[PDB]
């Protein structure tokens, strides 16, 4: 009567990501491919804008473009909601508020299709300033480490997730992106509702020297922590 979804992540799992985007009426599509290894919290992915030039900076899409690949230590396994929803998956909803600028709303389904973990997203961005840091492409091509705060939402049989992303501006300052996130299971099976805890994230962005399309190569490591009982 308990989920066994964690067993789907004991080894390397192939990933596909598909994003349909519209920001201030600027439409785009992004595809990602790679693999994930939850035993080390490790993601290896390459993303391509298949429709032309990406109308927003790649860093602003990183959070939108699979937290089931977080490493949950053995003493925290009962707090891993993301894997417990698998293989049927979960819906991931966000609003991302860019300080003094527009917001992204995103709705994704994350689930297994065959042997592959697939993240399928729709993104809508509104109220951006064409001369701001996003539509004006003023953000550095890099990424910082963050803390992601996870809380149970028992009434929705899911979780609430809150965190702040800081995008370095190419001049000096930082662009804040305030993330409000909700995850709910797609299936009717049992899920794990966690005690409060956090994920520690680290992301490296690079380019493929042979790729002529607009693209992003991403290497990411994420480990859950903050529950000390049983260490």
């Amino acid at each position: 009567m308990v989920s066994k979804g964690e067993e789907l992540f004991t080894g390397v799992v192939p990933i596909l990501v598909e994003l349909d985007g519209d920001v201030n009426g600027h439409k785009f599509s992004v595809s990602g491919e790679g693999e994930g290894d939850a035993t080390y919290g490790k993601l290896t992915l390459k993303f391509i804008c298949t429709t032309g030039k990406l109308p927003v900076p790649w860093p602003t899409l990183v959070t939108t473009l699979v937290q089931c690949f977080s490493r949950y230590p053995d003493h925290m396994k009962q707090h891993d909601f993301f894997k417990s929803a698998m293989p049927e998956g979960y819906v991931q909803e966000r609003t991302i508020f860019f300080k003094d600028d527009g917001n992204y709303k995103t709705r994704a389904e994350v689930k297994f299709e065959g042997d592959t973990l697939v993240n399928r997203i729709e993104l809508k961005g509104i109220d951006f300033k064409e001369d701001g840091n996003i539509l004006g492409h003023k953000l550095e091509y890099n990424y910082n480490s963050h803390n992601v705060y996870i809380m149970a939402d028992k009434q929705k049989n899911g979780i609430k997730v809150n965190f702040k992303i800081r995008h370095n501006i190419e001049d000096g300052s930082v662009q804040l992106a305030d993330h409000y996130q909700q995850n709910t299971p797609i299936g009717d099976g049992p899920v794990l509702l966690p005690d409060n805890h956090y994920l520690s994230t680290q992301s490296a962005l690079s380019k493929d020297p042979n790729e002529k399309r607009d693209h992003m190569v991403l290497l990411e490591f994420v480990t859950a922590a903050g529950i000390t009982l049983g260490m």
Partner: peptide, 16 residues
């Protein structure tokens, strides 16, 4: 200090 501005005391506040 680490990259997120945590000191050892921040890390230990989670239950240590």
């Amino acid at each position: 200090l680490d990259e997120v501005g945590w000191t050892p005391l921040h890390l230990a506040a989670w239950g240590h």
